[PDB]
């Protein structure tokens, strides 16, 4: 009976840790979605900028707005944090302890995401300009899309772990 009670308490603590992780993942996912919106906004107006009808003076304003968006992306990347921990500051790993026994943890992976990491870091449209702005931006967006896919997968895994732990604790 004492062993069973200890097991139940450990499983409850593991469920609480799983809740901590399930919140961390959704916060980071929302941050990256808000970042991706900026990439899309960059996409449409760099598409219009590539057209030769717009004069030289136009490209300066376009590049100014582009630089504003890039700086906003870098700022949102640096700022976002959870409980004194900067999620996007450095590429790293966080392990959520979801097992009462020692060593049973589920890994959460985070990769550093700044303006340089996604690519360009030197994006100019008024000249020399980037050799291929458009596919480079598409490649950048695909990376955040895969990142959201991974966070959704780990989100589902933590949800399943929580429900499994609840059933196990009730049976015990």
């Amino acid at each position: 009976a004492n062993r069973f009670t200890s097991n139940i308490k450990g499983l409850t603590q593991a469920a609480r840790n799983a809740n901590d992780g399930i919140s961390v993942a959704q916060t980071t996912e929302g941050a990256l979605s808000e970042i991706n919106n900026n990439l899309q906004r960059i996409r449409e107006l760099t598409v219009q900028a590539s057209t030769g009808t717009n004069s030289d003076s136009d490209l300066d304003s376009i590049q100014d707005e582009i630089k504003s968006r890039l700086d906003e992306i870098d700022r949102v990347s640096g700022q976002t944090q959870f409980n004194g921990v900067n999620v996007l500051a450095k590429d790293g790993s966080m392990k959520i302890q979801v097992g009462a026994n020692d060593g049973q943890t589920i890994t959460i992976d985070l990769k550093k995401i700044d303006s340089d990491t996604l690519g360009l870091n030197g994006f100019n449209v008024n000249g020399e300009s980037t050799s291929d702005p458009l596919a480079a931006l598409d490649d950048a967006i695909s990376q955040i899309d895969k990142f959201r896919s991974s966070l959704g997968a780990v989100q589902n895994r933590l949800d399943s772990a929580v429900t499994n732990l609840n059933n196990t604790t009730t049976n015990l």
Partner: protein, 49 residues
């Protein structure tokens, strides 16, 4: 009666309610906004597409 220290039946009922909780929350959250994906707890490939 047989169990006086522990209400295991209450635990079963609470588990059923908790199981319904996620469905209710997801349903109302998806109802509030137009998007079905809604910050994809749902299928990731569809969200990427």
């Amino acid at each position: 009666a047989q169990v006086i220290n522990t209400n295991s039946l209450s635990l079963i009922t609470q588990n059923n309610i908790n199981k319904n909780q996620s469905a209710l929350s997801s349903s109302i959250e998806r109802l509030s906004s137009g998007l079905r994906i809604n910050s994809a707890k749902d299928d990731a490939a569809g969200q990427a597409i």
